[PDB]
Design an enzyme around this catalytic site. Sequence first.
Site, PDB file in Angstrom:
ATOM      1  CB  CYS A 190     -44.772 -45.174 -13.398  1.00 47.36           C
ATOM      2  SG  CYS A 190     -45.614 -44.886 -11.840  1.00 47.36           S
ATOM      3  NE  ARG A 227     -47.526 -45.360 -16.496  1.00 52.36           N
ATOM      4  CZ  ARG A 227     -47.590 -45.733 -17.769  1.00 52.36           C
ATOM      5  NH1 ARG A 227     -47.923 -44.845 -18.707  1.00 52.36           N
ATOM      6  NH2 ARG A 227     -47.348 -47.005 -18.101  1.00 52.36           N
ATOM      7  CD1 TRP A 242     -48.251 -46.230  -2.620  1.00 55.92           C
ATOM      8  CD2 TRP A 242     -49.190 -44.211  -2.420  1.00 55.92           C
ATOM      9  NE1 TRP A 242     -49.407 -46.227  -3.391  1.00 55.92           N
ATOM     10  CE2 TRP A 242     -49.995 -44.995  -3.282  1.00 55.92           C
ATOM     11  CE3 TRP A 242     -49.576 -42.896  -2.144  1.00 55.92           C
ATOM     12  CZ2 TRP A 242     -51.153 -44.496  -3.876  1.00 55.92           C
ATOM     13  CZ3 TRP A 242     -50.735 -42.408  -2.729  1.00 55.92           C
ATOM     14  CH2 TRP A 242     -51.508 -43.205  -3.581  1.00 55.92           C
ATOM     15  CD  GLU A 272     -41.023 -49.326  -5.631  1.00 54.06           C
ATOM     16  OE1 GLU A 272     -40.214 -48.532  -6.179  1.00 54.06           O
ATOM     17  OE2 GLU A 272     -42.119 -48.963  -5.135  1.00 54.06           O
TER      18      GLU A 272
HETATM   19  C1  HEM Z   1     -48.266 -43.112  -5.864  1.00 52.39           C
HETATM   20  C2  HEM Z   1     -47.524 -44.233  -5.751  1.00 52.39           C
HETATM   21  C3  HEM Z   1     -46.567 -44.739  -6.776  1.00 52.39           C
HETATM   22  C4  HEM Z   1     -46.204 -46.049  -6.900  1.00 52.39           C
HETATM   23  C5  HEM Z   1     -46.719 -47.181  -6.045  1.00 52.39           C
HETATM   24  C6  HEM Z   1     -45.256 -46.156  -7.956  1.00 52.39           C
HETATM   25  C7  HEM Z   1     -44.678 -47.383  -8.345  1.00 52.39           C
HETATM   26  C8  HEM Z   1     -43.561 -47.409  -9.178  1.00 52.39           C
HETATM   27  C9  HEM Z   1     -42.673 -48.509  -9.304  1.00 52.39           C
HETATM   28  C10 HEM Z   1     -42.774 -49.809  -8.540  1.00 52.39           C
HETATM   29  C11 HEM Z   1     -41.714 -48.190 -10.213  1.00 52.39           C
HETATM   30  C12 HEM Z   1     -40.557 -49.064 -10.647  1.00 52.39           C
HETATM   31  C13 HEM Z   1     -39.317 -48.641  -9.860  1.00 52.39           C
HETATM   32  C14 HEM Z   1     -38.186 -49.637  -9.966  1.00 52.39           C
HETATM   33  O1  HEM Z   1     -38.363 -50.832 -10.358  1.00 52.39           O
HETATM   34  O2  HEM Z   1     -37.029 -49.258  -9.649  1.00 52.39           O
HETATM   35  C15 HEM Z   1     -42.004 -46.879 -10.648  1.00 52.39           C
HETATM   36  C16 HEM Z   1     -41.238 -46.251 -11.600  1.00 52.39           C
HETATM   37  C17 HEM Z   1     -41.435 -44.908 -11.843  1.00 52.39           C
HETATM   38  N1  HEM Z   1     -42.361 -44.076 -11.317  1.00 52.39           N
HETATM   39 FE1  HEM Z   1     -43.798 -44.500 -10.137  1.00 52.39          FE
HETATM   40  N2  HEM Z   1     -45.015 -44.943  -8.469  1.00 52.39           N
HETATM   41  C18 HEM Z   1     -45.790 -44.026  -7.828  1.00 52.39           C
HETATM   42  C19 HEM Z   1     -45.839 -42.641  -8.013  1.00 52.39           C
HETATM   43  C20 HEM Z   1     -45.055 -41.926  -8.926  1.00 52.39           C
HETATM   44  C21 HEM Z   1     -44.983 -40.515  -9.071  1.00 52.39           C
HETATM   45  C22 HEM Z   1     -45.719 -39.511  -8.206  1.00 52.39           C
HETATM   46  C23 HEM Z   1     -44.134 -40.238 -10.149  1.00 52.39           C
HETATM   47  C24 HEM Z   1     -43.708 -38.924 -10.694  1.00 52.39           C
HETATM   48  C25 HEM Z   1     -44.433 -37.796 -10.608  1.00 52.39           C
HETATM   49  C26 HEM Z   1     -43.668 -41.497 -10.627  1.00 52.39           C
HETATM   50  C27 HEM Z   1     -42.807 -41.663 -11.686  1.00 52.39           C
HETATM   51  C28 HEM Z   1     -42.143 -42.876 -11.891  1.00 52.39           C
HETATM   52  C29 HEM Z   1     -40.988 -42.940 -12.803  1.00 52.39           C
HETATM   53  C30 HEM Z   1     -40.389 -41.818 -13.618  1.00 52.39           C
HETATM   54  C31 HEM Z   1     -40.547 -44.204 -12.774  1.00 52.39           C
HETATM   55  C32 HEM Z   1     -39.387 -44.777 -13.559  1.00 52.39           C
HETATM   56  C33 HEM Z   1     -38.028 -44.428 -12.948  1.00 52.39           C
HETATM   57  C34 HEM Z   1     -36.887 -45.039 -13.739  1.00 52.39           C
HETATM   58  O3  HEM Z   1     -36.881 -45.117 -15.006  1.00 52.39           O
HETATM   59  O4  HEM Z   1     -35.913 -45.459 -13.084  1.00 52.39           O
HETATM   60  N3  HEM Z   1     -44.277 -42.489  -9.886  1.00 52.39           N
HETATM   61  N4  HEM Z   1     -43.151 -46.400 -10.020  1.00 52.39           N
HETATM   62  C1  LIG Z   2     -31.057 -46.762  -9.248  1.00 51.30           C
HETATM   63  N1  LIG Z   2     -32.122 -47.351 -10.088  1.00 51.30           N
HETATM   64  C2  LIG Z   2     -32.226 -46.620 -11.370  1.00 51.30           C
HETATM   65  C3  LIG Z   2     -33.005 -45.341 -11.170  1.00 51.30           C
HETATM   66  C4  LIG Z   2     -32.440 -44.118 -11.542  1.00 51.30           C
HETATM   67  C5  LIG Z   2     -33.149 -42.931 -11.352  1.00 51.30           C
HETATM   68  C6  LIG Z   2     -34.423 -42.984 -10.786  1.00 51.30           C
HETATM   69  C7  LIG Z   2     -35.002 -44.206 -10.406  1.00 51.30           C
HETATM   70  O1  LIG Z   2     -36.261 -44.210  -9.835  1.00 51.30           O
HETATM   71  C8  LIG Z   2     -37.126 -45.354  -9.702  1.00 51.30           C
HETATM   72  C9  LIG Z   2     -38.441 -44.882  -9.099  1.00 51.30           C
HETATM   73  C10 LIG Z   2     -38.999 -43.678  -9.529  1.00 51.30           C
HETATM   74  C11 LIG Z   2     -40.196 -43.206  -8.988  1.00 51.30           C
HETATM   75  C12 LIG Z   2     -40.853 -43.944  -8.010  1.00 51.30           C
HETATM   76  C13 LIG Z   2     -42.044 -43.484  -7.464  1.00 51.30           C
HETATM   77  C14 LIG Z   2     -42.682 -44.234  -6.486  1.00 51.30           C
HETATM   78  C15 LIG Z   2     -42.124 -45.442  -6.074  1.00 51.30           C
HETATM   79  N2  LIG Z   2     -42.742 -46.189  -5.124  1.00 51.30           N
HETATM   80  N3  LIG Z   2     -40.957 -45.868  -6.623  1.00 51.30           N
HETATM   81  C16 LIG Z   2     -40.308 -45.151  -7.575  1.00 51.30           C
HETATM   82  C17 LIG Z   2     -39.106 -45.618  -8.117  1.00 51.30           C
HETATM   83  C18 LIG Z   2     -34.278 -45.387 -10.588  1.00 51.30           C
HETATM   84 CL   LIG Z   3     -36.217 -47.529  -3.538  1.00 54.22          CL
END
Ligand code: HEM
Ligand SMILES: CNCc1cccc(OCc2ccc3ccc(N)nc3c2)c1
Ligand SMILES: [Cl-]
Lengths: 362, 362
Positions: free
Chosen positions: B65, B68, B237, B242
């Site tokens: 993420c 963070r 957000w 994405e």
């Molecule tokens: C506030 C704005 C936020 C932005 C802009 C953001 C941005 C991102 C982005 C761009 C990714 C990569 C997703 C992808 O490539 O598919 C990501 C992954 C992730 N974000 Fe964030 N995020 C935010 C908030 C959060 C919040 C609130 C949480 C949880 C409480 C979170 C947890 C995660 C997790 C767990 C992943 C990885 C998911 C996976 O392994 O598929 N994020 N985030």
């Molecule tokens: C289908 N892609 C694999 C896969 C499996 C399960 C969760 C997931 O989430 C990605 C993800 C998680 C959290 C996010 C929070 C904010 C954001 N802008 N994108 C976010 C994108 C992605």
């Molecule tokens: Cl998405």
Amino acid sequence: EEKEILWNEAKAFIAACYQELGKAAEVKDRLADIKSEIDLTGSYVHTKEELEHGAKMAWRNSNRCIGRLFWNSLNVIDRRDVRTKEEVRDALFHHIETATNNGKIRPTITIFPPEEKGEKQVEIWNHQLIRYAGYESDGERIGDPASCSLTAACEELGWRGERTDFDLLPLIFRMKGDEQPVWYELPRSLVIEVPITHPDIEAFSDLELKWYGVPIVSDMKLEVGGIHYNAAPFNGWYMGTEIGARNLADEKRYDKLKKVASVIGIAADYNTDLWKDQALVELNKAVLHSYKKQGVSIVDHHTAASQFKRFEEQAEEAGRKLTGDWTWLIPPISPAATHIFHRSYDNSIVKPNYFYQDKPYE
Amino acid sequence: EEKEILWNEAKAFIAACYQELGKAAEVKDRLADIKSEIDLTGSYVHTKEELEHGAKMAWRNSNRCIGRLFWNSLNVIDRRDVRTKEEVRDALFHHIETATNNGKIRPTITIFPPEEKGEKQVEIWNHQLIRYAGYESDGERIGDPASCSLTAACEELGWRGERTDFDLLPLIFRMKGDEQPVWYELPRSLVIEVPITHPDIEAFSDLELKWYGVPIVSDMKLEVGGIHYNAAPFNGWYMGTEIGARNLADEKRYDKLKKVASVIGIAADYNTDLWKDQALVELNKAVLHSYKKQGVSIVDHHTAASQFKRFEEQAEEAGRKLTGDWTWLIPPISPAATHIFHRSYDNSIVKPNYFYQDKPYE
Ligand code: HEM
Ligand SMILES: CNCc1cccc(OCc2ccc3ccc(N)nc3c2)c1
Ligand SMILES: [Cl-]
Ligand code: HEM
Ligand SMILES: CNCc1cccc(OCc2ccc3ccc(N)nc3c2)c1
Ligand SMILES: C[C@H](O)[C@H](O)[C@H]1CNc2nc(N)[nH]c(=O)c2N1
Ligand SMILES: C[C@H](O)[C@H](O)[C@H]1CNc2nc(N)[nH]c(=O)c2N1
Ligand SMILES: [Cl-]
């Protein structure tokens, strides 16, 4: 004791190499001779065939290289016979000339004598045979910052750059037994340079950007069957992004994005405008356009990725494990538009291969 | 025997959590109570304070993420009290409404009852609460291909999509003891959508692209101190890439690059033209422009990377190891223009955290 390390690496290489050459039966006797040679002398010598195939295998095993489809057509120049700095100089000159080939670049490697007791016979200081100098005195930043330390080392040895942004560094290398390296200015007639213009935007030439035609990496060690070729410069042709998205774009390199944005006529004020991205694309279009217009070989990252996909497929058909470094295989421009981005790669090290070695300056 | 695993994870969490809350002295007694509770009952229950901080820690520890920096302002909604599918539905509706906040998105997580014996109390089938259906019959491809399997599962349960390219999937989840999940259509008044227009190119609207405002990930498990919250949807957000570089661009998703190139008026015939790259940038500009124009929160990848740099700095000052997944942290558009590209990251897993879990469909 080290004969043990040499012996195993040799067994492994000769078996794999001769197997690939259809000469699987000739292994036992070749291995016998080698085993005998190591005992008697501490080392062994590659035949021209083994050395040539080894350099090719090394390219095939370079995890970070997207251009590996063409591994088997590498032009291997065997120069293990050189004994003098005039010969080394002339071998380096010839490599530049032959690899360049009037713009139709031939992937080439020139192989100098290997290390004996870990002692180098020839030690090349250049990172690439052709590269631009870099300067940084009080406030003033000129040329390529990546070249600052080598540039300073050259100026210690009596060389002096003109301090343009594109001073060609001299060839600089040291011979066994010599305490200091020697340096030789590059004949400008040997070095092709490409002015960067844009296909659509005439103002682009106001930037006065240029780059050299052939990247010839001269500071890595080729390792083949336990034998260490520390001096073995090699080249392919450029992938455009290396020039347009890194050499010219990186803040720690030429840092031209803000200037690109100005000449292409967009504001460089707001991140949400994606002005860096737009600049990167126009800069990268310009680089490909210029090289092509001048008749100098270059590949775009999409075509390069398509080729690498064919390399993967070919690896599979041949029954060879594929290895790669995803973090170096993805291009720095639109990586998700290539298939590379969407798979993973086993980053294991397989020999023969090319390795980093410590810089003698720094 | 599993009480041992639960106990250690609990010791580790409560010590770290209370330490961070300035309540380091209250640990021994809280741990005592917990130790007692595990023995007597097999499990233990988080206070609202522990649960809230744990969800925040989990976001802080999400290696993939980039967003963070804002971990400590996560809005945690504790819904461990729900017992019925009407309550679950209404909790999901409320989350959509409160997180959306008329466009000024609040990062929010709603936490449902945890697993007891590994048995789920509530099992959410949606990948995101708001997502588009996908269809693939003979030759015909409609909507989002990533949604094909879930869409087919919904249509098994009596739901039927209109088969536009942007059908909203219903909420679909299963309650403990129920053999089948239930589904509820989303009230369209709750779901903000953004039409994609371009700041400069009026023809861009001919593509009739749109996307939803808030990505609410609903299929990951939150783990805090040995307690497994399999149902805990969360949102931030969007980062523009994405949507613009993946959801709309990927060949296995909406695959719009060739159509983008047409409306922006460039040929899509030659790789060396970098038409995909140019299309990606214009598409990504359009996405940011549209969200901003509608007053829906979104971040560009440059600003996002700058924020993440501040997260790194903050991590250091606080004396916390930083962990990250470089391969997910780099944006898919101009990654080398961010600082992330030029460093490496320790990809170790630290708990509390969010984890993948198996899909009940498929
Ligand atoms: C506030 C704005 C936020 C932005 C802009 C953001 C941005 C991102 C982005 C761009 C990714 C990569 C997703 C992808 O490539 O598919 C990501 C992954 C992730 N974000 Fe964030 N995020 C935010 C908030 C959060 C919040 C609130 C949480 C949880 C409480 C979170 C947890 C995660 C997790 C767990 C992943 C990885 C998911 C996976 O392994 O598929 N994020 N985030
Ligand atoms: C289908 N892609 C694999 C896969 C499996 C399960 C969760 C997931 O989430 C990605 C993800 C998680 C959290 C996010 C929070 C904010 C954001 N802008 N994108 C976010 C994108 C992605
Ligand atoms: Cl998405
Ligand atoms: C024919 C055209 C070739 C192309 C287009 C090509 C492309 C590339 C690119 C883009 C990189 C990444 C460089 C970077 O990011 O700094 C690379 C790395 C590499 N290439 Fe190739 N290459 C080609 C030929 C060759 C040849 C002939 C060899 C050796 C015989 C070679 C060996 C390597 C090695 C060793 C690396 C990694 C260097 C390192 O770790 O720093 N390549 N290649
Ligand atoms: C200074 N960057 C680290 C470093 C150290 C040593 C060698 C090296 O080479 C990168 C490299 C190697 C071989 C290449 C072959 C062809 C090509 N177009 N680029 C190529 C780029 C890069
Ligand atoms: C697993 C494989 O490396 C694959 O490309 C991964 C990694 N890179 C990614 N990066 C992002 N942002 N999103 C993804 O879905 C993926 N997929
Ligand atoms: C080590 C760190 O991940 C760094 O960004 C590396 C990896 N990615 C790269 N990729 C390319 N093509 N070239 C580089 O110099 C680097 N540097
Ligand atoms: Cl280079």
